[PDB]
Design a protein around this ligand. Structure first.
Ligand SMILES: Cc1cc2nc3c(=O)[nH]c(=O)nc-3n(C[C@H](O)[C@H](O)[C@H](O)COP(=O)(O)O)c2cc1C
Ligand SMILES: Cc1cc2nc3c(=O)[nH]c(=O)nc-3n(C[C@H](O)[C@H](O)[C@H](O)COP(=O)(O)O)c2cc1C
Ligand SMILES: O=C1C[C@@H](C(=O)O)NC(=O)N1
Ligand SMILES: O=C1C[C@@H](C(=O)O)NC(=O)N1
Lengths: 312, 312
């Protein structure tokens, strides 16, 4: 069976890539993702200038996933642009860059720099509208006026196909409102559902203390916590945004979860917490497991079942 | 040693009660809750007229909790009012009633009927601003203008202290905005955090079909999925609304989870999915387990640690 995905003129060997933020901050990280069996990779959500991020501890692995408040530690846009222009081996796989300016002005400055490199190399933009661990910066995706402004200014500045990393929604009316904004921007060719379930709290019963230092212990949840939310968001936008692709992100630990994401509507499938836990070898495993399911069900390609989840 | 709680003018034997919607729809349900070891109980979220709710299947037990789209099945406000006025044994424990009118006009008519019964019997109101499984009805709590209207009109019609059942928030700006609205209504004396994580989607990989019938498989998540979200919401409102109580609801399966809720600021702890799984015997187990933790830590009362979660 074929795991191939054909989107934006590119051939991807399989639907798997890292979730933005995991194994993608440094040159070494990005090398390891390139050498892995993943179909693609994405750079850390970057800002105009470098950031060291939040104080420690800011990450904690959980039995059911992860909580983090990293605070967008990144080497700055120039580093990732340079990686995309000079270092990355495009013969191995295509590259995405995530950009997370803390203002529309910052985002505009950054994407303008990407234009020449997208034209030359084919580097793909994911605009992050859901960074939940920066003190004093609300998630853009939870204000539809602000979301409209970002999409307007970035569409105009970048002028090329791009995608958006969205926060999870939990209300039908929000799925509708979000889709209505997204559908006004034709250059938005993909939607990544979802970012962390924002601002959860984990407390250690032994010492009666929170497990992360920033924001009084409040951090984004990933892993097993997020699968049903992720599947819901993937399916909601798959149906509401037929002119666009949907990328799935959340709760993928196995080919089974990957299969469910694709059944829900996903084109690419991103792996965060599970990759942080296991390392890039996970991609070899995911390919094997997804192949096995497709073999068992007699699916020859992903296109035979993408978005074909059955309702009652 | 004592699990006792003194709030809203009552002594509660212990902090435990059912989550609204679980073991509280029929007279038989309410009898079993009253006979249980629970410190209190709350009636099913009711409407002006009876409802039978959504078609089957509308509930599905999961390894990590539950998904439901019940659709507010209830015997109508008159039934729960008559239970409160005539049937309930107040010498056993205090009674809460949840009310979830599908419009502000419906809510007003309902709470007006409760006034004489609160005055006579001491019945407590929990206004549901987070009912996520009624098609065409957005969650009131995710619209702060609508929330303000409900609180204004109910404050006016009811005119006595009451509480609110809130949806989970995932963004610091939303915690701020929610608290700003709540803090404008002095009659709001408690905040229950949280209702289900709304509009999750569960898919069976074997038959490639959603597991519940209503809303294309979309339903509220309960159980292990929601504990970090619940703790965060409890603590966020505990800090932002110092003139109000907070009740904890989400992911309680054991004395340990109860302990964490109370540490975060919970006065009362509600049990949903776990109670559905185990039946009312769980309250005897929870009392024993909580006391065990307190014994090990050398605490004699809940007041020794309620709201005393430590940050770094
Ligand atoms: C350590 C860590 C760092 C992350 N950094 C980013 C980031 O820079 N940009 C982003 O859009 N999402 C970031 N995320 C969120 C993930 O991309 C992903 O949306 C989320 O973890 C859910 O996927 P999962 O269930 O596979 O973990 C980060 C998550 C983790 C755990
Ligand atoms: C079968 C079922 C019915 C529910 N009905 C109601 C309801 O009528 N009103 C309400 O406010 N919450 C209702 N809920 C939500 C619960 O009160 C609770 O907030 C949620 O399940 C999270 O708690 P848990 O993790 O202990 O399940 C219901 C949940 C379930 C599972
Ligand atoms: O988009 C983001 C940003 C990242 C961080 O905190 O750096 N962590 C997240 O969970 N999501
Ligand atoms: O508040 C509510 C309503 C209930 C239902 O659907 O009846 N189910 C829920 O999960 N929460």
């Amino acid at each position: 069976m074929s795991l191939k995905v054909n989107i934006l003129g590119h051939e991807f060997s399989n639907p798997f890539m890292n979730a933005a933020g995991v194994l993608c901050t440094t040159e070494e990280d990005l090398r390891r993702m390139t050498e892995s069996e993943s179909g693609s990779l994405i750079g850390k959500s970057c800002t105009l200038a470098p950031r060291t991020g939040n104080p420690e501890p800011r990450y904690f692995g959980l039995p059911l996933g992860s909580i983090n408040s990293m605070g967008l530690p990144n080497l700055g846009v120039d580093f990732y642009l340079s990686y995309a222009a000079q270092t990355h081996d495009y013969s191995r796989k295509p590259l995405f860059l995530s950009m997370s300016g803390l203002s529309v002005e910052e985002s505009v400055e950054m994407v303008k720099k990407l234009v020449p490199i997208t034209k030359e190399k084919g580097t793909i933009l994911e605009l992050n509208l859901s960074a939940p661990n920066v003190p004093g910066k609300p998630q853009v995706g939870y204000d539809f006026d602000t979301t409209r402004t970002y999409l307007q200014k970035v569409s105009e500045a970048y002028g090329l196909p791009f995608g958006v990393k969205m926060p999870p929604y939990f209300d039908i009316a929000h799925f509708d409102m979000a889709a209505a904004v997204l559908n006004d921007f034709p250059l938005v060719k993909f939607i990544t559902c979802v970012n962390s379930i924002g601002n959860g709290l984990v407390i250690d019963p032994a010492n009666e203390t929170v497990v992360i230092k920033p924001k009084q212990g409040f951090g984004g949840l990933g892993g097993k916590y997020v699968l049903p939310t992720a599947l819901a968001n993937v399916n909601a936008f798959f149906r509401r945004c037929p002119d666009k692709l949907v990328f799935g992100c959340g709760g993928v630990y196995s080919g089974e979860e990957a299969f469910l994401h694709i059944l829900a509507g996903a084109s690419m499938v991103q792996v965060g917490t599970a990759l942080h836990d296991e390392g890039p070898i996970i991609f070899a495993r995911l390919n094997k497991e997804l192949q096995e399911i497709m073999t068992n069900k007699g699916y020859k390609t992903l296109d035979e079942f993408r978005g074909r989840v059955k309702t009652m």
